[PDB]
Coordinates of C-alpha atoms and ligand atoms in Angstrom, one line a residue:
Chain K
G1 CA 17.5 3.2 -10.3
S2 CA 19.3 4.9 -13.1
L3 CA 19.0 6.7 -16.6
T4 CA 20.2 4.6 -19.5
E5 CA 23.6 5.3 -21.8
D6 CA 21.3 7.6 -23.9
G7 CA 19.9 9.5 -21.1
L8 CA 16.8 9.1 -22.8
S9 CA 15.0 6.5 -20.6
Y10 CA 15.1 5.1 -16.9
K11 CA 15.5 1.8 -15.7
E12 CA 14.7 0.1 -11.7
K13 CA 14.7 -3.0 -10.2
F14 CA 12.4 -4.0 -7.5
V15 CA 12.1 -7.1 -5.3
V16 CA 8.3 -7.9 -4.6
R17 CA 7.1 -8.0 -0.9
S18 CA 5.1 -10.5 1.0
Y19 CA 2.0 -7.8 1.3
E20 CA 2.2 -6.7 -2.5
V21 CA 1.0 -10.1 -3.2
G22 CA -2.6 -11.8 -3.8
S23 CA -4.1 -15.2 -3.1
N24 CA -1.9 -16.4 -6.2
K25 CA 1.3 -15.5 -4.2
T26 CA 1.8 -13.0 -7.2
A27 CA 1.9 -9.0 -7.4
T28 CA -1.5 -7.6 -7.5
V29 CA -2.2 -5.2 -10.4
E30 CA -2.8 -2.4 -7.9
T31 CA 1.2 -3.3 -6.4
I32 CA 2.3 -3.2 -10.5
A33 CA 0.5 0.2 -10.7
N34 CA 2.4 1.8 -7.6
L35 CA 5.9 0.4 -9.4
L36 CA 5.2 2.0 -12.7
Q37 CA 4.3 5.1 -10.6
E38 CA 7.3 5.1 -8.5
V39 CA 9.6 4.5 -11.5
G40 CA 7.9 7.4 -13.4
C41 CA 8.8 9.7 -10.3
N42 CA 12.2 8.5 -10.0
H43 CA 13.0 9.1 -13.6
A44 CA 11.8 13.0 -13.2
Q45 CA 14.0 13.6 -10.3
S46 CA 16.7 12.1 -12.1
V47 CA 16.4 14.7 -14.8
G48 CA 16.0 17.8 -12.6
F49 CA 12.2 17.7 -12.1
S50 CA 12.6 18.1 -8.4
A51 CA 6.8 16.7 -12.9
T52 CA 6.6 20.2 -13.8
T53 CA 9.5 22.6 -15.0
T54 CA 9.8 26.2 -13.9
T55 CA 7.4 27.5 -16.7
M56 CA 4.7 25.3 -15.7
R57 CA 4.9 26.2 -11.5
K58 CA 4.9 30.0 -12.5
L59 CA 1.6 29.5 -14.5
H60 CA 0.3 26.8 -11.5
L61 CA 0.1 24.0 -14.5
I62 CA 0.2 20.5 -13.8
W63 CA 0.4 17.2 -15.5
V64 CA -2.8 15.1 -15.1
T65 CA -3.6 11.6 -16.2
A66 CA -6.0 11.4 -18.7
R67 CA -5.9 7.2 -19.5
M68 CA -4.1 4.4 -18.5
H69 CA -3.8 1.1 -20.0
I70 CA -1.9 -2.0 -18.4
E71 CA -1.4 -5.4 -20.3
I72 CA 0.3 -8.1 -18.0
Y73 CA 1.6 -11.4 -19.4
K74 CA 2.6 -12.6 -16.3
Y75 CA 2.5 -11.4 -12.7
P76 CA 5.9 -11.6 -10.6
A77 CA 6.0 -13.8 -7.6
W78 CA 6.6 -12.9 -4.1
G79 CA 10.5 -12.5 -4.0
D80 CA 10.9 -12.2 -7.6
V81 CA 13.0 -9.4 -9.0
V82 CA 11.0 -7.3 -11.5
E83 CA 12.8 -4.9 -13.7
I84 CA 10.9 -1.7 -15.4
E85 CA 12.2 0.3 -17.9
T86 CA 10.1 4.2 -18.6
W87 CA 10.4 7.0 -21.2
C88 CA 7.9 9.9 -22.2
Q89 CA 7.2 11.4 -25.3
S90 CA 5.6 14.5 -26.6
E91 CA 2.1 14.1 -28.3
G92 CA 2.3 17.2 -30.0
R93 CA 0.0 19.7 -28.3
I94 CA -2.4 17.1 -27.1
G95 CA -0.3 16.3 -24.2
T96 CA 2.4 14.0 -23.4
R97 CA 2.6 10.0 -23.0
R98 CA 4.6 7.8 -20.5
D99 CA 5.4 4.1 -21.6
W100 CA 7.0 1.5 -19.4
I101 CA 8.2 -2.2 -20.0
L102 CA 8.4 -4.7 -17.2
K103 CA 10.7 -7.7 -17.7
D104 CA 11.7 -10.6 -15.1
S105 CA 15.2 -10.0 -14.3
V106 CA 16.5 -13.2 -14.5
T107 CA 15.4 -14.1 -18.2
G108 CA 15.2 -11.1 -19.5
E109 CA 11.6 -11.3 -21.1
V110 CA 8.8 -9.1 -21.5
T111 CA 6.3 -9.8 -18.6
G112 CA 4.2 -6.6 -19.2
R113 CA 3.7 -3.3 -20.7
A114 CA 2.1 0.0 -20.1
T115 CA 1.3 3.5 -21.4
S116 CA -0.7 6.4 -20.2
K117 CA -2.1 9.9 -21.4
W118 CA -1.2 12.7 -19.7
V119 CA -2.7 16.4 -20.3
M120 CA -1.9 19.9 -19.2
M121 CA -4.2 21.4 -16.3
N122 CA -4.1 24.5 -14.0
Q123 CA -4.1 23.5 -10.4
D124 CA -6.4 26.0 -9.3
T125 CA -9.3 26.1 -12.1
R126 CA -8.9 22.8 -13.1
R127 CA -9.0 23.9 -16.7
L128 CA -7.5 21.9 -19.4
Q129 CA -4.8 23.5 -21.8
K130 CA -3.5 22.7 -25.0
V131 CA 0.8 22.3 -24.8
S132 CA 2.7 25.5 -25.7
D133 CA 6.3 25.8 -27.4
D134 CA 7.8 27.1 -24.4
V135 CA 7.1 24.0 -22.6
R136 CA 7.2 21.5 -25.2
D137 CA 11.3 22.5 -25.7
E138 CA 11.9 22.1 -21.9
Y139 CA 10.6 18.6 -22.0
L140 CA 11.9 17.3 -25.8
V141 CA 15.5 17.1 -24.9
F142 CA 14.6 14.3 -22.0
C143 CA 12.4 12.3 -24.7
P144 CA 13.9 10.2 -27.6
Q145 CA 12.9 12.0 -30.7
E146 CA 11.9 9.1 -33.2
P147 CA 8.8 7.4 -31.9
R148 CA 9.2 4.5 -29.4
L149 CA 5.9 3.0 -28.2
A150 CA 5.3 0.2 -25.6
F151 CA 2.0 -0.7 -27.9
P152 CA 3.1 -0.2 -31.4
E153 CA 0.9 -2.7 -32.9
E154 CA -2.1 -1.2 -35.5
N155 CA -5.5 -0.9 -34.1
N156 CA -4.1 -1.9 -30.3
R157 CA -6.2 -2.0 -27.0
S158 CA -4.6 1.1 -25.7
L159 CA -6.3 3.3 -27.9
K160 CA -10.1 2.3 -28.3
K161 CA -13.1 4.3 -27.4
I162 CA -14.8 3.8 -23.9
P163 CA -18.5 3.5 -23.7
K164 CA -20.7 4.6 -20.5
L165 CA -22.3 1.9 -18.7
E166 CA -26.0 2.1 -18.6
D167 CA -27.9 1.2 -16.0
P168 CA -28.7 -1.0 -14.5
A169 CA -25.2 -2.6 -14.2
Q170 CA -25.0 -6.5 -13.4
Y171 CA -22.8 -5.9 -10.3
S172 CA -21.9 -3.0 -7.9
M173 CA -19.8 -2.1 -5.1
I174 CA -21.3 0.8 -3.4
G175 CA -20.2 3.4 -0.4
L176 CA -16.5 3.0 -1.3
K177 CA -14.7 6.3 0.4
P178 CA -10.6 6.8 0.7
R179 CA -8.9 6.2 3.6
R180 CA -5.5 8.5 4.5
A181 CA -3.6 5.9 3.2
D182 CA -5.1 6.3 -0.3
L183 CA -3.9 9.8 -0.6
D184 CA -0.5 10.8 -1.7
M185 CA 2.1 13.5 -0.3
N186 CA -0.2 16.6 -1.9
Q187 CA -3.7 15.2 0.0
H188 CA -5.1 13.9 -3.3
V189 CA -6.5 10.5 -4.1
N190 CA -3.7 8.2 -5.6
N191 CA -4.3 7.2 -9.1
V192 CA -4.2 3.5 -8.3
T193 CA -7.0 3.5 -5.7
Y194 CA -9.4 4.1 -8.5
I195 CA -7.8 1.2 -10.1
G196 CA -8.7 -0.8 -6.7
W197 CA -12.1 0.8 -6.9
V198 CA -13.0 -0.5 -10.5
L199 CA -11.9 -3.8 -9.8
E200 CA -14.3 -4.0 -6.3
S201 CA -17.3 -4.9 -8.2
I202 CA -15.6 -8.0 -10.1
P203 CA -17.7 -11.1 -8.6
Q204 CA -15.1 -13.0 -6.1
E205 CA -15.6 -16.0 -8.5
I206 CA -13.9 -13.9 -11.7
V207 CA -11.0 -13.2 -9.1
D208 CA -10.3 -16.7 -8.2
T209 CA -10.8 -18.5 -11.4
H210 CA -9.3 -15.8 -13.7
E211 CA -6.1 -13.5 -13.8
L212 CA -6.3 -9.9 -15.0
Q213 CA -4.6 -9.8 -18.7
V214 CA -5.7 -5.9 -19.4
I215 CA -7.2 -2.6 -17.5
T216 CA -7.8 0.4 -19.7
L217 CA -8.8 3.2 -17.6
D218 CA -10.0 6.9 -18.3
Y219 CA -9.8 9.9 -15.7
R220 CA -12.5 12.2 -16.1
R221 CA -12.8 13.8 -12.6
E222 CA -10.8 13.3 -9.4
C223 CA -12.9 12.0 -6.2
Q224 CA -12.0 14.5 -3.6
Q225 CA -11.1 13.1 0.4
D226 CA -14.8 13.6 1.6
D227 CA -16.2 12.2 -1.5
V228 CA -18.2 8.5 -1.5
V229 CA -17.9 6.1 -5.1
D230 CA -19.9 3.7 -6.5
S231 CA -18.5 1.1 -8.8
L232 CA -20.2 -0.5 -11.5
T233 CA -19.6 -3.5 -13.9
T234 CA -21.2 -5.4 -16.6
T235 CA -20.0 -8.4 -18.5
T236 CA -20.0 -7.6 -22.3
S237 CA -18.1 -10.8 -23.5
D238 CA -11.9 -14.9 -22.0
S239 CA -14.1 -12.6 -19.8
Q240 CA -14.4 -9.0 -20.8
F241 CA -16.1 -6.4 -18.3
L242 CA -17.1 -2.4 -18.9
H243 CA -16.9 -0.1 -15.9
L244 CA -18.2 2.8 -14.5
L245 CA -17.1 5.0 -11.0
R246 CA -19.4 7.5 -10.4
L247 CA -20.1 9.7 -7.1
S248 CA -22.7 8.3 -4.9
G249 CA -25.2 10.8 -4.5
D250 CA -25.6 12.9 -7.7
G251 CA -24.1 10.0 -9.9
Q252 CA -21.5 12.1 -11.5
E253 CA -18.9 10.1 -13.5
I254 CA -15.2 9.8 -12.3
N255 CA -13.6 7.3 -14.2
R256 CA -15.1 4.5 -17.1
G257 CA -12.7 1.5 -18.0
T258 CA -12.8 -2.0 -19.6
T259 CA -10.9 -5.5 -18.4
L260 CA -10.0 -8.2 -19.9
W261 CA -9.6 -11.8 -17.9
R262 CA -7.8 -14.8 -19.2
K263 CA -8.9 -18.4 -17.6
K264 CA -6.4 -19.8 -15.1
Chain G
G1 CA 18.3 -8.5 3.6
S2 CA 20.3 -11.3 5.8
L3 CA 21.0 -12.7 9.0
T4 CA 23.6 -11.2 11.3
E5 CA 26.8 -12.7 12.3
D6 CA 25.5 -15.1 15.0
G7 CA 22.5 -16.0 13.3
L8 CA 20.1 -14.6 15.8
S9 CA 18.8 -11.9 14.1
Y10 CA 17.6 -10.6 10.9
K11 CA 18.2 -7.0 9.0
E12 CA 17.3 -5.4 6.0
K13 CA 17.4 -1.9 3.9
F14 CA 14.6 -0.1 2.3
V15 CA 14.5 2.9 0.3
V16 CA 11.3 5.3 0.8
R17 CA 9.0 5.3 -2.2
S18 CA 6.7 8.3 -3.6
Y19 CA 3.5 6.3 -2.9
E20 CA 4.8 5.5 0.9
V21 CA 4.9 9.3 2.4
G22 CA 2.1 11.6 3.6
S23 CA 1.8 15.4 3.3
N24 CA 5.0 15.8 5.2
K25 CA 7.0 13.9 2.5
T26 CA 7.8 11.5 5.2
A27 CA 6.9 7.7 5.4
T28 CA 3.5 7.3 7.2
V29 CA 3.2 5.0 9.9
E30 CA 1.1 2.4 7.8
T31 CA 4.5 2.2 5.6
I32 CA 6.5 1.7 8.7
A33 CA 4.1 -1.0 9.7
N34 CA 4.2 -3.0 6.4
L35 CA 8.0 -2.6 6.4
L36 CA 8.2 -4.4 10.1
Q37 CA 6.2 -7.2 8.8
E38 CA 8.1 -7.6 5.7
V39 CA 11.2 -7.6 7.4
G40 CA 9.7 -10.4 9.8
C41 CA 8.5 -12.6 7.0
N42 CA 12.3 -12.9 5.5
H43 CA 13.5 -13.4 8.9
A44 CA 11.1 -16.3 8.8
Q45 CA 12.0 -17.7 5.2
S46 CA 15.6 -17.0 5.9
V47 CA 15.8 -19.4 8.8
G48 CA 13.6 -22.3 6.8
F49 CA 9.9 -21.2 8.1
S50 CA 6.7 -20.4 6.1
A51 CA 6.0 -18.7 10.3
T52 CA 5.1 -22.3 11.4
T53 CA 7.0 -25.3 12.2
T54 CA 6.2 -28.6 10.8
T55 CA 4.8 -29.8 14.2
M56 CA 2.5 -26.7 14.1
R57 CA 0.8 -27.6 10.6
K58 CA 0.2 -31.1 11.8
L59 CA -1.9 -29.5 14.4
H60 CA -3.1 -26.6 12.3
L61 CA -1.9 -24.1 14.7
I62 CA -0.8 -20.3 13.6
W63 CA 0.7 -17.4 15.2
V64 CA -1.6 -14.8 15.5
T65 CA -0.8 -10.9 16.6
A66 CA -2.4 -9.9 19.9
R67 CA -0.3 -6.6 20.8
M68 CA 1.6 -4.3 18.5
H69 CA 3.3 -1.3 20.3
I70 CA 5.3 1.0 17.9
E71 CA 7.6 4.3 18.7
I72 CA 9.0 6.7 16.0
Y73 CA 11.7 9.7 16.9
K74 CA 11.9 10.6 13.5
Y75 CA 10.0 9.3 10.3
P76 CA 12.5 8.7 7.3
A77 CA 11.6 10.9 4.1
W78 CA 11.0 9.9 0.6
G79 CA 14.2 8.7 -0.9
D80 CA 16.0 8.0 2.6
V81 CA 17.5 4.6 3.4
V82 CA 16.1 2.9 6.7
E83 CA 17.6 -0.2 8.0
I84 CA 15.6 -2.6 9.9
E85 CA 16.8 -5.2 12.6
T86 CA 14.4 -7.6 13.7
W87 CA 14.5 -10.7 16.3
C88 CA 12.3 -13.3 18.1
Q89 CA 12.0 -14.2 22.1
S90 CA 10.2 -16.9 23.8
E91 CA 7.9 -15.4 26.7
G92 CA 7.5 -19.1 27.8
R93 CA 4.3 -20.8 27.5
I94 CA 2.3 -17.5 26.7
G95 CA 3.7 -17.1 23.4
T96 CA 6.5 -15.3 21.7
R97 CA 7.4 -11.6 20.9
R98 CA 8.9 -10.0 17.8
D99 CA 10.9 -6.6 18.3
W100 CA 12.4 -4.0 15.7
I101 CA 14.8 -1.6 15.7
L102 CA 15.1 1.2 13.3
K103 CA 17.7 3.3 12.2
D104 CA 18.4 5.9 9.7
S105 CA 21.2 4.4 7.2
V106 CA 23.5 7.2 6.9
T107 CA 23.7 8.5 10.4
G108 CA 23.2 5.1 12.2
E109 CA 20.8 6.8 14.7
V110 CA 18.2 4.9 16.1
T111 CA 14.8 6.4 14.6
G112 CA 12.2 4.3 15.7
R113 CA 11.6 1.2 17.7
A114 CA 8.6 -1.6 17.9
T115 CA 7.5 -4.7 19.8
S116 CA 4.8 -7.1 19.3
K117 CA 3.3 -10.3 21.1
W118 CA 1.9 -13.4 19.2
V119 CA 0.1 -16.0 20.8
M120 CA -0.5 -19.9 19.4
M121 CA -4.2 -20.4 18.0
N122 CA -6.2 -23.2 16.1
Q123 CA -6.3 -21.8 12.4
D124 CA -10.0 -23.5 12.0
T125 CA -11.8 -23.2 15.7
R126 CA -9.9 -19.8 16.4
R127 CA -9.2 -21.0 20.1
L128 CA -5.9 -20.2 21.7
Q129 CA -3.3 -22.5 23.4
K130 CA -0.4 -22.1 25.4
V131 CA 3.1 -23.0 24.0
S132 CA 3.9 -26.5 24.5
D133 CA 7.8 -27.8 24.7
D134 CA 7.9 -29.4 21.6
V135 CA 6.9 -26.3 19.7
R136 CA 9.0 -24.1 22.0
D137 CA 12.3 -26.3 21.1
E138 CA 11.6 -25.9 17.5
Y139 CA 12.1 -22.2 17.5
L140 CA 14.8 -21.4 20.5
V141 CA 17.6 -22.0 18.4
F142 CA 16.5 -19.1 16.3
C143 CA 16.3 -16.6 19.3
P144 CA 19.0 -15.4 21.4
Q145 CA 19.1 -16.8 24.5
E146 CA 19.8 -14.1 27.1
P147 CA 17.1 -11.3 27.0
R148 CA 17.3 -8.5 24.0
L149 CA 14.3 -6.1 24.6
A150 CA 13.4 -3.0 22.0
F151 CA 11.9 -1.6 25.2
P152 CA 13.6 -2.2 27.9
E153 CA 13.0 0.4 30.6
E154 CA 11.2 -0.3 33.7
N155 CA 7.9 1.4 33.5
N156 CA 7.7 1.7 29.7
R157 CA 4.4 2.3 27.7
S158 CA 4.5 -1.4 25.6
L159 CA 3.1 -3.7 28.5
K160 CA 0.3 -1.0 29.5
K161 CA -3.4 -2.0 30.2
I162 CA -6.0 -0.2 27.7
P163 CA -9.2 0.5 28.5
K164 CA -12.5 0.1 26.6
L165 CA -13.7 3.5 25.3
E166 CA -17.0 4.6 27.1
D167 CA -20.1 5.9 24.4
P168 CA -20.2 8.5 23.4
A169 CA -17.0 9.0 21.4
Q170 CA -15.8 12.3 20.8
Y171 CA -14.7 11.3 17.2
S172 CA -15.6 8.7 15.1
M173 CA -15.4 7.2 11.2
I174 CA -18.2 4.7 10.4
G175 CA -19.0 2.4 7.6
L176 CA -15.3 1.4 7.2
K177 CA -14.9 -1.6 4.6
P178 CA -12.1 -3.7 3.4
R179 CA -11.1 -3.7 -0.2
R180 CA -9.0 -6.5 -2.1
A181 CA -5.9 -4.3 -1.7
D182 CA -6.6 -4.6 2.5
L183 CA -6.4 -8.4 2.1
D184 CA -3.1 -10.5 2.5
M185 CA -2.2 -13.7 0.4
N186 CA -4.8 -15.7 2.7
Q187 CA -7.5 -13.6 2.2
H188 CA -7.2 -12.2 5.7
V189 CA -7.6 -8.6 6.7
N190 CA -4.0 -7.3 6.8
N191 CA -2.9 -6.0 10.5
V192 CA -1.7 -3.0 9.3
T193 CA -5.3 -1.9 7.8
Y194 CA -6.6 -1.9 11.4
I195 CA -3.9 0.7 12.2
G196 CA -5.4 3.1 9.3
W197 CA -8.7 2.4 10.6
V198 CA -8.2 3.6 14.0
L199 CA -6.0 6.5 12.7
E200 CA -9.5 7.3 10.6
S201 CA -11.2 8.8 13.4
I202 CA -8.3 10.9 14.6
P203 CA -9.3 14.8 13.3
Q204 CA -7.4 16.3 10.6
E205 CA -6.2 19.2 12.4
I206 CA -4.0 17.0 14.8
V207 CA -2.8 15.3 11.8
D208 CA -1.8 19.0 10.2
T209 CA -0.1 20.3 13.4
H210 CA 1.3 17.0 15.2
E211 CA 3.0 14.0 14.5
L212 CA 2.7 10.7 15.8
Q213 CA 5.0 9.3 18.2
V214 CA 3.5 6.2 19.7
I215 CA 0.9 3.8 19.0
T216 CA -0.2 0.8 21.4
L217 CA -2.8 -1.6 19.8
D218 CA -4.6 -4.7 21.2
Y219 CA -6.1 -7.1 18.5
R220 CA -9.1 -9.1 20.3
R221 CA -10.9 -10.4 16.7
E222 CA -10.8 -10.4 13.1
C223 CA -12.4 -8.3 10.7
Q224 CA -13.8 -10.7 8.1
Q225 CA -14.0 -9.5 4.2
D226 CA -18.0 -8.7 4.3
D227 CA -17.4 -6.9 7.8
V228 CA -18.3 -3.2 8.3
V229 CA -16.1 -1.5 11.2
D230 CA -16.6 2.1 13.2
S231 CA -13.9 3.6 14.7
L232 CA -14.1 5.8 17.8
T233 CA -11.4 8.1 19.5
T234 CA -11.5 10.4 22.6
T235 CA -8.8 12.6 23.7
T236 CA -7.8 11.7 27.2
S237 CA -4.8 14.2 27.8
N238 CA 2.3 20.3 24.0
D239 CA 1.4 16.2 23.7
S240 CA -2.2 14.8 22.7
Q241 CA -3.0 11.1 23.8
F242 CA -6.0 9.5 22.4
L243 CA -8.0 6.4 23.6
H244 CA -9.1 4.1 20.7
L245 CA -11.6 1.8 19.9
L246 CA -12.6 -0.5 16.4
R247 CA -15.9 -2.2 16.5
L248 CA -18.1 -3.9 13.9
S249 CA -20.6 -1.6 12.8
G250 CA -23.6 -3.6 13.5
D251 CA -23.9 -5.7 17.0
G252 CA -20.9 -3.4 18.0
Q253 CA -18.5 -6.3 18.8
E254 CA -15.0 -5.4 19.6
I255 CA -12.3 -6.0 17.1
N256 CA -9.2 -3.7 18.5
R257 CA -8.9 -1.2 21.3
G258 CA -5.8 1.1 21.1
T259 CA -3.9 4.5 22.2
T260 CA -2.0 6.7 20.8
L261 CA 0.3 9.6 21.5
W262 CA 1.1 13.0 19.4
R263 CA 3.6 15.6 19.7
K264 CA 3.8 19.0 18.6
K265 CA 5.5 19.8 15.2
Ligands
2O0_1 N1 4.1 12.2 -18.8 C1 4.8 12.8 -17.6 O1 5.2 12.3 -17.2 C2 5.0 14.3 -17.8 C3 6.2 15.2 -17.7 N2 7.6 14.7 -18.2 C4 6.9 14.9 -19.9 N3 8.3 14.3 -20.6 C5 8.9 13.9 -19.4 C6 10.4 13.1 -19.4 C7 11.5 13.0 -18.3 C8 10.5 13.1 -17.2 C9 9.6 13.7 -16.9 C10 8.7 14.2 -18.3
2O0_2 N1 6.8 -14.2 16.9 C1 7.1 -14.6 15.4 O1 7.4 -14.3 14.2 C2 6.3 -16.1 15.8 C3 7.5 -16.9 15.1 N2 8.6 -17.3 15.4 C4 9.0 -17.3 16.5 N3 10.3 -17.8 16.9 C5 11.0 -17.1 15.3 C6 12.2 -16.9 15.0 C7 12.4 -16.7 13.9 C8 11.4 -16.4 12.9 C9 10.2 -16.6 13.4 C10 9.8 -17.3 14.6

């Protein structure tokens, strides 16, 4: 992969692997989400964040995901080459935004798009903080100055408020636990694992007859390595669903989300 | 990737990804196992397979793994390029063997090796069968004729008999269930998921202070999508060795047995 000519965005190509595909022989949404995070990590490395600055490190500050929104028009097939372009933008003191565009390498056609909201958090106390000028200035030289959005349309799905699913849930998958393969290099549960857990409570019939078109996921709290999760889903409708991930015992909310599925 | 000049083996390069590494910033054994299976699949495609012959498809026959043996000397770091060479060999009527060699692309040094035993099975009845001549002839033109082994040594670890772990287990991890990401394109649990399940019952202290050098895993029975698994481990041993058992949570039906050898960091 490489930064583009202006140095304000990053592109990378991926050949879809045999173990990365589902029953349709196309990439799963978890494979896509792993590639989005891989291209984000390579962008941070390419510009010297080897994604915290020296100022953030001295104050024990990290960027954490608050929201992830992905829209797929066509999933790449096993053996296909997909090209992903990524860039970041400041959202004032609220935090930052990372956007992505996915294209079929052979046709140049946009096959997907994603956006994510990141907030600054103290790694030890877990307390959220607003973005200061000293930090903003250090990142702004790596972002386009004019707005550049993967989801520019007015009243789009990436900025919609998500309600809390009320008991009883129509569907559920309980006792979900992370294994070592679900943890990142810092021993925290990978963000993509939560997408998988959300999808576990969708009935197999919907998965067999529909394709996932849109997923919006809010991250409220992290799941620890020794935590147990319950995945809850209710049909709200194309089929639309409301989702809730919560700790198995006390019922503490870890995530909330929505999915939209198209008939095959 | 590509077949080599003689067309009897296949090579491929991989750049290690950020989500593929563990706490030491190096590839996990599950990432290595996924790459071994990816290079095996690309080898089958490059020579016209999909990895059944037309004769096997007529009889509803498939190749299934009976044993997997992996030895890692050095795990590749995040951002490193690893080169993997793979080839197959017939083992008469018992089945076939797929071997692999892993190298650091920059130094050319062998950083790992693996071997696996495959048997022919009817897809529907799940009954094993010996390799017939008609089938053997169809894949022998894709294999080296002189023996070529990743583990040539006389008393190597890849051919050792594995005993059944006796209750009580020293360690255990109970209630393990596969999710959709653990299934392959045919909705069967991926072979690599069983390696992860075996490793789940190793204490975190061993993982934090040791590196996995060798893993030998026997595949006895398949875990269904709605099955629940119990992972059991007992220390058998500067090096720590363990005996492993995966069994169904209810009836205690054996799905896998294995051994691991770990060295101090
Ligand atoms: N959302 C993020 O990836 C936060 C870190 N970050 C903010 N602006 C950036 C520009 C380039 C690389 C990482 C950047
Ligand atoms: N061990 C296997 O991968 C079984 C299938 N198979 C047998 N001989 C082969 C030669 C090349 C590719 C796949 C082959």
